[PDB]
Amino acid sequence: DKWEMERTDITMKHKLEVYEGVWKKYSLTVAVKTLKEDTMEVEEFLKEAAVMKEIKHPNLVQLLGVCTREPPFYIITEFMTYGNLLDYLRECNRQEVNAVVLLYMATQISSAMEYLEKKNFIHRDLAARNCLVGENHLVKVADFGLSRLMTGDTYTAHAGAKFPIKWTAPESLAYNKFSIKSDVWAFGVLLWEIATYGMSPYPGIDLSQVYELLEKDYRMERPEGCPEKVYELMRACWQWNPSDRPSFAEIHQAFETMFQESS
Numbered sequence: 713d714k715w716e717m718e719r720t721d722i723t724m725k726h727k728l729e730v731y732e733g734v735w736k737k738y739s740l741t742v743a744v745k746t747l748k749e750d751t752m753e754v755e756e757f758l759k760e761a762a763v764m765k766e767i768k769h770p771n772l773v774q775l776l777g778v779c780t781r782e783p784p785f786y787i788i789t790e791f792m793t794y795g796n797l798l799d800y801l802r803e804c805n806r807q808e809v810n811a812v813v814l815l816y817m818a819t820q821i822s823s824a825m826e827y828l829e830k831k832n833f834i835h836r837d838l839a840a841r842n843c844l845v846g847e848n849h850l851v852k853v854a855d856f857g858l859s860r861l862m863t864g865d866t867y868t869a870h871a872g873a874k875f876p877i878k879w880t881a882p883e884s885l886a887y888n889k890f891s892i893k894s895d896v897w898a899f900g901v902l903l904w905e906i907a908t909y910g911m912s913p914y915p916g917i918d919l920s921q922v923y924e925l926l927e928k929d930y931r932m933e934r935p936e937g938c939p940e941k942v943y944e945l946m947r948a949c950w951q952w953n954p955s956d957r958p959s960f961a962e963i964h965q966a967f968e969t970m971f972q973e974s975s
C-alpha cells in the first residue's frame with residue numbers, strides 16, 4: 713500500500729484538528745488531518761480517504777499519504793496557502809480578484825466536477841468553504857466527503873442526517889437522495905457565493921421556510937454585477953427536476969467559452 717507511511721515522516725507546525733506540517737523526506741509543506749479516538753464517525757472518514765486514492769485532477773485536493781495502522785490517524789494532503797475560498801473572496805482586493813478572475817475560478821471548479829461526473833462520484837458538500845485557494849487564484853475542490861456510485865444513479869444518506877440547508881437540492885432535503893444532479897444544484901449556490909464575494913445564501917430567510925419557498929419556485933435574485941448568461945446558468949442549476957439541470961460537462965464547456973471570451 714504505497715499510500716501508507718509512518719507518522720515520524722511528518723513534523724507538525726501549526727494547527728489550523730487539521731495541521732500545517734512538513735513532509736521531511738521532500739521538504740514539502742503539507743496538510744495533516746488527525747483523528748484522536750476510534751469512533752465509527754472516524755472510520756467512515758478513513759474509508760473516504762481510500763476513495764481519494766483513485767482521484768487525480770489538477771483542481772482537486774491531492775492525497776499524499778495516510779497513517780491507518782494505529783491512532784492517532786493521519787490523512788496527508790497537499791497544502792493550499794490561501795485557505796478556503798469563502799474567506800478568500802470576502803477579504804480580497806476586488807480590483808485584483810475581478811470578474812475575469814471569478815470566471816476563472818468557476819471554470820476550475822466545473823472542470824473538477826466534470827471529472828467526478830465521468831468517474832461517477834458525488835461530492836455531497838459543494839460550497840465555497842470547501843474550496844481551497846492556492847497561488848495565482850488557483851482553486852481546488854476539497855474532496856474529502858466523496859462517495860462512489862457503486863450501483864445506479866442515487867446515493868441515499870442515513871435517515872436523520874443533517875445537511876447544509878441552503879446548499880442542498882430539494883430532492884436531498886425531502887428524501888435524503890443525492891446524485892450528480894444534486895451536486896449541480898449545490899454548484900449553482902457556489903456560483904452565487906462566488907458572484908457575491910462570499911455573501912450568505914438566501915440572506916435573512918428562515919431555514920425552516922427554505923424548502924417551501926423552493927417548492928413555490930422562489931430562487932435567489934441575480935447578484936449585482938453578475939452577467940446575465942451566468943445567472944441563466946445559475947437558474948438552470950436550480951431547476952426543480954434533477955433531469956432538467958445541466959451536466960457538469962455542459963457547464964464546463966459554457967465556462968470555458970465565457971472565460972476565453974474575456975480578452
Ligand SMILES: *Cc1cc(-c2c[nH]c3ncc(-c4cncc(C(=O)N(C)C)c4)cc23)ccc1B(O)O
Nearest residue numbers: 728730743745789790791792793794795796844856
Ligand atoms: C480534511 C480537511 C482538509 C483541509 C485542508 C487540506 N489542505 C489544506 N490546505 C490548506 C488549508 C488551510 C490553510 N490555511 C487556512 C485555512 C482556513 O481556511 N482557516 C484556518 C479558516 C485552511 C486547509 C487544508 C481542511 C479541512 C479539512 B476537514 O474536513 O476538517
